[PDB]
Structures are given as C-alpha cells and as structure tokens.
Design a protein that fits this description.
The structure is a homodimer. With 219 residues, chain A is an alpha+beta fold. Helix content of chain A is 55%, strand content 8%. The structure holds S-hexylglutathione (2 copies). Chain A: Belongs to the GST superfamily. Alpha family.
Chain lengths: 219, 221
C-alpha cells in the first residue's frame, strides 16, 4: 500500500488522497504532528527537499505534489491515452492547481490581505476558470473533460468544485455543465465512497490545524 | 508542418524554461512578442488563451497554455522525460524542487522593496542548504553524467538553467558543490545548449527594471 506522509490536514496532500481514492487504491497515512515528527523524516533522509507531501509507493520516496500526482495518474490510467491527451489534461489541471493554490493558501494570507484575496478568488472563478471549464464541456458535449473517459482532470476539477462550494455555493450556479459534472463524478462508486463520512477525505482547515501547521513547518 | 510558436512578452519570466527546453531538444521555434496590454487582449479576444494568460505555445495544432502543460508535452515528445513512469517520477521530483527555487527567483523582482532583502537572504540560505545539497546528493549517488536514467533529460536542462540564474545571483553559491559545477559545464557543452548559450539566440537577458515595467503595463499589475 502507498503510504502518505503529511500532517492531518488538507494542505498539499488532499489532491493525492482524492486521486488515489478515485482510482480504487487503498493507502496508509502516517501523520506528522510535531516539528520533530518532521525532523525525523528529514534526518532519516526520507525527504529529498526536507519537505512533505512525501509518498512511499513502488519503492520510491516521492516528494513534490506533482511528482506524486503525475505518477499515480499514469500508473492508474488516469492520464489520457497519448501525449496530446496528457497535454490537454495538463493544461486543464494546471489551471485548476493555480486556482487551487489560491484557495489552499487563503488561511496563511496576512489577515489584511484576506478580504481583497477572497474577492479576487471569487472573481477569477466567475470570469476566468469556470467559463473555461464550461467551454470545454460544452465544446464536446461529453461526460468527461478529455477523451470521453474518466481522467485526473475530472478528479481534480471536481475536488476544486467542492472547495468552491465551501467558499460560496452561488458560484457554480450559472455553470450548469459543471454542476452536471460535479454530480456524475461524485456518483462514481470510488469517489462516492471517498465523499462519505469516515473516509480519509479531510475537512476544511480550521484555526488549530493552521496553528499545528505553523508549529510543524516552522512558519 | 509548422515551427512551434511561443507567445509571451520579450523576457525570461515564465517562458524561459520552454525556450531552454525546446532549444536543448534542438527544436527551432518562432516567438511572438506581446508588447502591450492591447497585444494580450487580442490573444484573449481571438480565443487563443484557455485562462486568458500566457505562456502560450502553439505546437501540434494545440494552443497550450500553462508552463507545465507546455514543458511536459515537449519533454515527452523529444524523449526528455525518462524512459518510463518510475523515471518520470524522479524527473518530476527533481524538476519540481527546481521550479520551487525558480519561482523564488523569478518573483523576487516583484517583492515589495521592504521584503526584498530578507527574501534574497533566504533564497541564498535555501540554495546552500536545501536545493544544492539535494542535487549534489543525486549526482553523488550514481556518479553519472545526467540526473536521471544516465541520459539527458529535462531534469538536466532545467537544473542547469537554474545554475545560470543562481550564478547571476551570486556566483559563490555553487562553489562547495563540485558535481553541479561539472554538470553545468558538460550540459553547457552539448551542441544544442552551447548554441543556445551563444550570442544572438532566443535565450533572454535577466529582467531589468524597464522590462519589469512593461511586465506591469501588459499584465496589469
Ligand atoms: C495551507 C498550508 C499547508 C501547510 C504548509 C505547506 S505544505 C508543507 C511544506 N511542503 C511544501 O511546501 C512542499 C512544496 C512542494 N512544492 C510540494 O508541492 O511538495 C513543508 O515541508 N515545509 C517545510 C519546509 O519547507 O521547511
Ligand atoms: C515578475 C513578472 C514575471 C511575469 C510573470 C507573469 S507571466 C504572465 C501571467 N501568466 C501566468 O501567471 C500564467 C501562470 C500559469 N500557472 C503558468 O505557469 O503558465 C499572465 O498572463 N497574467 C495575465 C493575467 O493573469 O491576467
């Protein structure tokens, strides 16, 4: 089993739990709770850059998020059929991580920039991202983002549509094909199971989890 | 068919690694330099930008945006992404550490004047103690001339590129990392990269204040 090393939070390991889950892979977590929990990993050389996410899979100690994602996605057939499909996928999931980054790091934001930053995430989701994934679905009419078969593009988009809902549920309201997608993916057996309570899907990041972040990562 | 066509403004910024990668692959490409907010609104209005942003690269009938979509595609097409999935994973780990440092250096010129000095000192710490030791370590681990699978890959082109920006920052940083020195020489010495390093190629100069203002004027920031 893949073993995921992170603290017990969404952070930069969430899209990996979803991709693994969506692919039917069961995995272990090992939760770092302390700065010295992290230092242990560092000292045992388990971390190429002294950072996590790290994931033990197939004898490798893979750090860097995209390293983990790209590897899962190919291994489990979720990276399209050819390089032209990977390229469309990549283009999509990169627009998505760019928005996912903005939202991953709102709680770390200096508090005086927080208002200006929400407003602009909302504005980008309305004007920039959503219309772009709506154009895609509308262009081919198909159930999936690419090559008419499930891929990680569908996993990462739907995940982000969950966070966009937590932010403001009005936002997706005029992107009906996104709504349709959100639904269909969420009713895929493995994702439905992942979205159920007691799964390893993790909650929004509250306060103490943030404070648990600063302590472990020393920031 | 058609040379790939790169769409950016006339600066390093987010298009430089692509320029590097395509040259190292010995692919001839065209550039179209955005000079103004108008030129960029035109690409927006013509539908050419999936997120209304550049880099964009027209290649193989696609309008690829997002540096990493473009990179991955070029890396794979020209066999510079390793020979399998386990290899692509080590390439991705390395080049993502590289991009983390690259981002830090790319964006330093945008940093507020009050932060710039603290930030640069932490770039220099991270280079000496985090990034460089991890790449020396890789090289030491196998003694081979390339970072992965013992043939040339984007892992080496990106790292070397970053060795040249780290050098501009402070040539003294790489000094306790001999194997990195050797990489940089050797890679710089491949025909394709050597030719790209020569005067009058598309390689771009470090961004001065004026280019930063054109960055300002164009992207509206
Ligand atoms: C909402 C914020 C989430 C919590 C903090 C950020 S993730 C923890 C952090 N890891 C990284 O930033 C890795 C970044 C890397 N690009 C990746 O995607 O793996 C770390 O080990 N930091 C330790 C260090 O770099 O010293
Ligand atoms: C110090 C400045 C260096 C220049 C960096 C900005 S490059 C221009 C910017 N592009 C992007 O942020 C694309 C980001 C994307 N994740 C990528 O990597 O391609 C843009 O078109 N922005 C226009 C917009 O967002 O509307």
């Amino acid at each position: 089993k893949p073993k995921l090393h992170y603290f017990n939070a969404r952070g930069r390991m969430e899209s990996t739990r979803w991709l693994l889950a969506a692919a039917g892979v069961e995995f272990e977590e090992k939760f770092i709770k302390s700065a010295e929990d992290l230092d242990k990993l560092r000292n045992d050389g388990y971390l190429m850059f002294q950072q996590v996410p790290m994931v033990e899979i197939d004898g490798m100690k893979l750090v860097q998020t995209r390293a983990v994602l790209n590897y899962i996605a190919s291994k489990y057939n979720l990276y399209g059929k050819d390089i032209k499909e990977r390229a469309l996928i990549d283009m999509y999931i990169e627009g998505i991580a760019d928005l996912g980054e903005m939202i991953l790091l709102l709680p770390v934001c200096p508090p005086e920039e927080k208002d200006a930053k929400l407003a602009l995430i909302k504005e980008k989701i309305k004007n920039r991202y959503f219309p772009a994934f709506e154009k895609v679905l509308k262009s081919h009419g198909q159930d999936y983002l690419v090559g008419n078969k499930l891929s990680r593009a569908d996993i990462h988009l739907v995940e982000l549509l969950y966070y966009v809902e937590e932010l403001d549920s009005s936002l997706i309201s005029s992107f009906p094909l996104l709504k349709a997608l959100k639904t269909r993916i969420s009713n895929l057996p493995t994702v439905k199971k992942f979205l159920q309570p007691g799964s390893p899907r993790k909650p929004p990041m509250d306060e103490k989890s943030l404070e648990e972040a600063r302590k472990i990562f020393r920031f």
